[PDB]
Amino acid sequence: SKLPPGWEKRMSRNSGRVYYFNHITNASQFERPSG
Secondary structure (H helix, E strand, C coil), rough: CCCCCCCCEEECHHHHHEEECCCCCEEEECCCCCC
């Protein structure tokens, strides 16, 4: 559950590859943004 604000984890359409999407910065990623 521990996660930074603004980010959100979702699942792809046909695939299930969790990723990091920021609704604020509108940026995307995959690796846990621990920085």
